[PDB]
Amino acid sequence: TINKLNRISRQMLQEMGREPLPEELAERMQMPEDKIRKVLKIAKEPISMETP
Amino acid sequence: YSYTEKKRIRKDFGTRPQVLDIPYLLSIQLDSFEKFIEQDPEGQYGLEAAFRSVFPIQSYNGNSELQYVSYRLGEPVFDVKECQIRGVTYSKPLRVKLRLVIFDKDAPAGTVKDIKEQEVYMGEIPLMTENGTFVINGTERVIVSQLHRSPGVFFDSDKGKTHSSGKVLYNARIIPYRGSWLDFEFDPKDNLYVRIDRRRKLPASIILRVLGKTSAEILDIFFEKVNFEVKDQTLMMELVPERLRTFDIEADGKVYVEKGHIRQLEKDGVNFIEVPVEYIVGKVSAKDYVNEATGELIITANQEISLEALANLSQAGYKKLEVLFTNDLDHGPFMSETLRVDSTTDRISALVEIYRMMRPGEPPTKEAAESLFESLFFSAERYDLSTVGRMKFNSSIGREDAEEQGTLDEVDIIEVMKKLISIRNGKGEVDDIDHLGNRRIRSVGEMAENQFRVGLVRVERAVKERLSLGDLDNVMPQDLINAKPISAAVKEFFGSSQLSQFMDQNNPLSEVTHKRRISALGPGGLTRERAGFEVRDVHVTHYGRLCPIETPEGPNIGLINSLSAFARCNEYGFLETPYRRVVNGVVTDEVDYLSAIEEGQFVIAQANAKLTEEGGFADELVTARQKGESGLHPREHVDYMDVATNQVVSIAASLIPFLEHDDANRALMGANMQRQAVPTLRSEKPLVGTGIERNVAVDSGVTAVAKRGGVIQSVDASRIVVKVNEEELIPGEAGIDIYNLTKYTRSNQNTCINQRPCVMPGEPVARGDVLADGPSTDLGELALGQNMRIAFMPWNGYNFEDSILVSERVVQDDRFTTIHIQELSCVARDTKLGAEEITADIPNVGEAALSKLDESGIVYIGAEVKGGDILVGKVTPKGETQLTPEEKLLRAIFGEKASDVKDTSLRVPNSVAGTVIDVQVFTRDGVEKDKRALEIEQMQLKEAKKDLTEEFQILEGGLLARVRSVLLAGGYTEAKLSSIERKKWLEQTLENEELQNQLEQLAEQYDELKADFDKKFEAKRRKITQGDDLAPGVLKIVKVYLAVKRRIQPGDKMAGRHGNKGVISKINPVEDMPYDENGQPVDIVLNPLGVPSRMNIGQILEVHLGLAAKGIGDKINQMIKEQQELAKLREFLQKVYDLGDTRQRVDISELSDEDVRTLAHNLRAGLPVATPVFDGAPESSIKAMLELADLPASGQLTLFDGRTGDAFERPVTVGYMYMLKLNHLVDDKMHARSTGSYSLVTQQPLGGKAQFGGQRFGEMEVWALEAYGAAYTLQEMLTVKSDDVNGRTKMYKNIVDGNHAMEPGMPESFNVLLKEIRSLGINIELED
């Protein structure tokens, strides 16, 4: 789901020229916008406790 | 004189005419970015250069390729201001035209089967603001230039500090812009070795072999040959005359000395010399000699000839033998001995050994070795000796070809070897590593290009991978590339780079100095624990290029420098300085920019050189400099002169008056300290200045400068509308200019940015005139501090060390009061339990704390708040909490229980009191807008429409004025026109075609005006209404801006411009401070003891000159108050401006009466004087100014003690000094903590004021306590104050119980220690 969201947001960005808003991404995925926001916020890799 | 300068003319004490005006101070940024962004039709700079360096992208098979055509930048979605408001990067879209060309497999290679044109988005490129800054993530940042080493070859030596003996060892190092390094060293055994990327040493004959050089070829290249023949059964020396100048010499007619000058006998000239056989024994063969009959090698190249070998070639019939030249002074056998220790004998073995040293532990194959050596230095993809690197390389070897080459070759390497061998021999010298022709400047354009090229290569790898598949029938160019790595690279450079720094914004000088800063640190530069003393010193080539004064005092000394006043960067990145030409003995107006290399040859005169009326020098011998050494040179041998007296120093040092009387240490401190000054409520000019302030103020961008001249139609504290002149108007333009002024906007250092109008309605203004003054600006002049009355004496110990005694009148007059604006943000997020809500229903808080919030839960605009007050109310859902039984009982007794939500609201920090000046609400797209956000949206839309309608009104007034001017070319009566109502003008009916056509034209123009106004307002509403791109999980953000007035108090730091800093110790009452005979008290008392030992004498001279200037101002004030005649006012002003033999000719006779009144009014508070650095006012001029004002010629008055009335026993130096309020305030540095937060792992108190942390008791403190013997205090600090979890709670309870006893235990840090040591598989434990 994350990978194919990345690819669809890829294609939309390259076709319109700007970062696609979650509403248009949900429209292209045929999935609810709440699910799109859940996927987008799911888990970015934890930052290290030694970052200067 | 311009209108802004005519309002207050500063008296100039300089004596040397200025022939070149100082250049624009922010050129180093704008020029570099223009190079980066502007289209380059020749393709050496910027985006075009990167695109041509990566493209065309060729598939490995050859099926198809992607080619670049052109690029363009789109229009920004937002401008600078709203980019700052929302918090987004100010940038432009990158659109590149690419063609996918697909070849035909059946057809021969190179046949264009198909083409596909398309425009592709390649990322977002950040833009430079007009002031040389970037707006990244809503913050202003400056990217500082880097001082690195120029690409090419450097020849160095160890200076005899490595081997046991001296034995100075020489090495050569080649460094490209991109690629691998190469090194060639000499060992203490006089053999030459090669290093590739700093790994194991090699014989260094390998590379020549790789290129295909036989041992004979190497010997031919690296040595000269001496010949031998067998002539008439005799040994036959081919004599070279220069060589001869221990045996008997032939040519019996001209016998030379035998076994015991040369030129006299060599004059005749003979070609026959006989030498003994033993002279051959020591020689080394230069060729490989083969015998056809034997089929073997009789003698090898680089082999010592022996008697048996001589006999062998004698029988072989060979009569000519050539051997190598070898001496101990001029020529050396170094390369031959190098060949002897070389085990390789062929090219394949050479590549094998190079591979083994490159990749140890890998099976070497011929193809892999060939690919590795080709890619190391002779591949365009992995090696690039750039244009600057190529020219430096060519100049080093003296090669005059291959200017556009980017890779090495046989010629380059062999010339490098030849130069290194030559320097070993004695001819040639090593290179200077700090010499500014050897170090290069790399600016924002170059590193932006570099990072863009990195991202482009990142794209190109995947594009090549995709193109190689083959299925390309339905692919477009926009489906092949990957914009996100490019965006990642540019945002890496603009957001996380060491050189992309938070903008210094204390004052305009801080901005200008930050933009003109050169750092040797950063990527590709120096590290601070690996940079020695030599790089930190002032090289002799810094003259006019890097300021020798301005550098940070601390670990970074010498590594961060400031551009000089007239310094410039040439097209290759090397600093150059202007000089005046000297022709026919006269010093001309023509200027030439010289680099470090060029400067050494000529003899350059100083700006202090005396000159005659004819343009030449007066003295027969003039003080000049050549090859970095100063001396006395004849007048006829001088080739250049300096253009200005501030050419050596930076801008901050150029702002220090009487700099030549200050030691370099205190000048350094003063230059560093002028950038920490905080702007005050009222900005005051410096009475004693240098004449540079106008340039800094205008070029900083803080002021509002007129783009076109005209008359100021409308003035208001936020707007200036100017009507442009007729002569300078563009055809078909509105004719009017609008300037919106920044009002009370927070800076990066939480200071105040305010622009105040300095014009009148109707005042004539020209181009370049200042209309509004920004922070620390007064009528277009930089104003960093205030003019303060100063007495130099001790006062009862209150100015002990560097302490400052300040009068109460200074605090009353609010002279050093500052406005500080602070940002506070409350973010309502989405959590597991529920959504955090912004509301006014705050549990456990009464109506006393809800007075200042509105219905939506946000404070009102203009609310005076103090510490602990609630700004924005927020409640967060909370889960079930275990109630202790003895609180369940209390719930039972009194039944109140309201704990559904927890109060997490934004509160004013402690010891912070101020006024709410602005509140902004950002709501996620799809979240309900509360009442307050709707109110902000409505007011924003109303203000936007009001401003747009106001513009329309004023520009339509200008346009209709121009139309009226067009009609008045004939001239009629417009009363008839006004007889018909304005709208009814569109209702007229015309039957004549001539009039009807004009009527239709006017109707169409009116329709177009309506359409454009509607489009503009629709776009503005779209921008206002769109939802914010809040972070994932964030529902709402509210931002509150607090304005705090800070008054001076003890503990604050004050300073002048001469390194004299101090801390205010007392605010003395006015009746206790020293006063003169007229009853006027001093304002600040400074300690004289700090002057003599620090050798900063410019401050005494500044004090005396300020006394004189204030006296002259008092005279003007008096002459205005008594309403004296204008003739005597003019006479006094002319007498004042004619004092001294200066370069300034101010003629009051050419100023109008109103102009004279304005000038006299602006001189009421003192006469501003300019004393340029190294061209300043002498003692005699200062004393003459003092006598003009009827003040003592010594600058010392008689002062009386306010406490007693008794006169002091000695006269005291009293004058006026420009003081600054540095951004080291006791409000931001006072901190205290009893008990607060603790660390997660170490369970120790946090660190810092923001975390309410605790002070650190370091190792040296523990040593001090051990030396005292205070065991119990030390145990308290170790255990019950830091990390004994139970002990610290017990200590708190005991103190509350009034017991004052502790029960120390084991620190948690020791338990963590034990756990990690056990995790390292080591049994560590405690025995009982």
mmCIF file of C-alpha atoms in Angstrom, chain B residues 228 230 235 275-283 298-299 304-321 323:
data_model
loop_
_atom_site.group_PDB
_atom_site.id
_atom_site.type_symbol
_atom_site.label_atom_id
_atom_site.label_comp_id
_atom_site.label_asym_id
_atom_site.label_seq_id
_atom_site.Cartn_x
_atom_site.Cartn_y
_atom_site.Cartn_z
ATOM 1 C CA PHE B 228 81.024 7.193 -26.590
ATOM 2 C CA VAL B 230 85.538 3.970 -30.978
ATOM 3 C CA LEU B 235 87.717 6.129 -26.835
ATOM 4 C CA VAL B 275 88.659 9.183 -21.730
ATOM 5 C CA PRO B 276 90.075 6.228 -19.752
ATOM 6 C CA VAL B 277 88.366 2.855 -19.599
ATOM 7 C CA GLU B 278 87.716 3.219 -15.854
ATOM 8 C CA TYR B 279 85.429 6.190 -16.589
ATOM 9 C CA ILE B 280 83.059 3.610 -18.098
ATOM 10 C CA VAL B 281 83.035 1.308 -15.047
ATOM 11 C CA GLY B 282 80.859 3.654 -12.995
ATOM 12 C CA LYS B 283 78.415 4.563 -15.766
ATOM 13 C CA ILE B 298 74.561 -8.444 -23.962
ATOM 14 C CA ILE B 299 73.768 -5.434 -21.760
ATOM 15 C CA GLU B 304 76.153 -0.616 -14.845
ATOM 16 C CA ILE B 305 78.792 -1.266 -17.505
ATOM 17 C CA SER B 306 81.641 -3.590 -16.519
ATOM 18 C CA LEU B 307 84.948 -4.548 -18.109
ATOM 19 C CA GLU B 308 83.554 -7.917 -19.203
ATOM 20 C CA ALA B 309 80.604 -6.120 -20.792
ATOM 21 C CA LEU B 310 83.028 -3.782 -22.560
ATOM 22 C CA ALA B 311 84.871 -6.790 -23.983
ATOM 23 C CA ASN B 312 81.565 -8.402 -24.971
ATOM 24 C CA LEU B 313 80.430 -5.380 -26.983
ATOM 25 C CA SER B 314 83.972 -5.109 -28.369
ATOM 26 C CA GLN B 315 83.666 -8.601 -29.850
ATOM 27 C CA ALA B 316 80.060 -7.843 -30.848
ATOM 28 C CA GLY B 317 81.338 -5.029 -33.082
ATOM 29 C CA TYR B 318 79.321 -2.240 -31.459
ATOM 30 C CA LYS B 319 81.364 0.968 -31.394
ATOM 31 C CA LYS B 320 78.920 3.555 -29.986
ATOM 32 C CA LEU B 321 77.697 3.401 -26.384
ATOM 33 C CA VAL B 323 74.901 6.184 -21.037
#
